[PDB]
Amino acid sequence: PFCX
Amino acid sequence: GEVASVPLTNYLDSQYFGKIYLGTPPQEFTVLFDTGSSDFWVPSIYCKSNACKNHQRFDPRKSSTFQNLGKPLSIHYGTGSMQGILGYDTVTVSNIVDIQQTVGLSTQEPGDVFTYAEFDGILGMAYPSLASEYSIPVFDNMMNRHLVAQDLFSVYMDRNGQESMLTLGAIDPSYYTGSLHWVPVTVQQYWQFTVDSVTISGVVVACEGGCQAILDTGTSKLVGPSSDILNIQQAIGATQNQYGEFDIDCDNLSYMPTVVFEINGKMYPLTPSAYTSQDQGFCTSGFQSENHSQKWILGDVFIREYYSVFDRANNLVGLAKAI
Numbered sequence: 001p002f003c004x
Numbered sequence: 005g006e007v008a009s010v011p012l013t014n015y016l017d018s019q020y021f022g023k024i025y026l027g028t029p030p031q032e033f034t035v036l037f038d039t040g041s042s043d044f045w046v047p048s049i050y051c052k053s054n055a056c057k058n059h060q061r062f063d064p065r066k067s068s069t070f071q072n073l074g075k076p077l078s079i080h081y082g083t084g085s086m087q088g089i090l091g092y093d094t095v096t097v098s099n100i101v102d103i104q105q106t107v108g109l110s111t112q113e114p115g116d117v118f119t120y121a122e123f124d125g126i127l128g129m130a131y132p133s134l135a136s137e138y139s140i141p142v143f144d145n146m147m148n149r150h151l152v153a154q155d156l157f158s159v160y161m162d163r164n165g166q167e168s169m170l171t172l173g174a175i176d177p178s179y180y181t182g183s184l185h186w187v188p189v190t191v192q193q194y195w196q197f198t199v200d201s202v203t204i205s206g207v208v209v210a211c212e213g214g215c216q217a218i219l220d221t222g223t224s225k226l227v228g229p230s231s232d233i234l235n236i237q238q239a240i241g242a243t244q245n246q247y248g249e250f251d252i253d254c255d256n257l258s259y260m261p262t263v264v265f266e267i268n269g270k271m272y273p274l275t276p277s278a279y280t281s282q283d284q285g286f287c288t289s290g291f292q293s294e295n296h297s298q299k300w301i302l303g304d305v306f307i308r309e310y311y312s313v314f315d316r317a318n319n320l321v322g323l324a325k326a327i
Contacts, residue, residue, distance in 0.1 A: 001292055001303070002018055002117070003082030004038030004126060004222010 027067025038222030045108030229297030
């Protein structure tokens with residue numbers, strides 16, 4: 001997972 | 005005054021990006037629409053990071069409406085980093101042409117976060133207060149220029165044969181079931197709002213007293229503070245992995261609980277199917293803890309379940325059962  | 009439909013593309017439920025065009029002639033970019041940031045950047049020809057040569061790079065020279073701002077851009081997400089130069093140009097988001105829009109031109113995107121990313125740049129959708137100096141968030145330029153029917157944008161999300169959708173100026177009721185429940189945004193920076201509590205069979209596992217959460221399309225999971233997410237991973241059935249992580253037994257969904265987010269007196273359950281991502285045999289938790297703690301981030305895991313509407317006009321977040 002990516003966390004903008 | 006107009007409305008715009010941005011088809012969102014879904015990569016492995018972790019990235020949602022739509023197409024956008026920058027300058028004249030229009031140059032095409034995919035951009036993740038991120039409600040957890042306020043800067044719009046795209047790779048540009050000044051960037052020689054691997055992430056830049058393997059993605060589409062804007063060429064301001066090829067664009068006549070491009071206007072150099074000169075002011076640097078540098079953004080740190082929780083996952084990723086970009087440095088850029090600020091400029092102006094025409095962004096076409098669908099059928100809404102957003103004239104004289106501040107857009108970051110990436111200069112360096114160190115690390116591999118964007119490198120193996122499906123999309124080129126990010127289009128922040130948070131409040132102006134989160135936007136870099138000199139930079140005006142895209143939806144903000146839209147509202148000031150009154151190019152949106154209403155100062156609202158809505159997000160729907162997920163998979164196969166498939167059609168996620170970002171709508172600007174409007175809400176598409178065909179993307180949700182039931183009624184939209186409006187949660188007031190407490191702190192205008194993030195799409196932050198209060199979550200009354202997190203329950204597992206009426207029992208609060210986390211978020212006791214209330215906690216602050218932000219609706220963030222650019223966050224893939226459901227992030228919460230360490231301790232709380234721990235108590236959730238154990239309350240569900242998860243285990244910690246053997247090369248770091250938390251795993252869920254895929255055959256065990258039926259026996260696992262529903263994690264209900266209470267938001268404004270209304271219940272937002274996340275079934276074991278929603279909070280569990282399967283990789284054909286291997287299921288992991290869609291719950292991610294934050295190295296530190298404090299704010300809960302409701303990512304595409306929650307968003308996939310709940311059609312979210314971000315109302316700038318009234319500083320509301322409308323939540324409804326995704327179709």
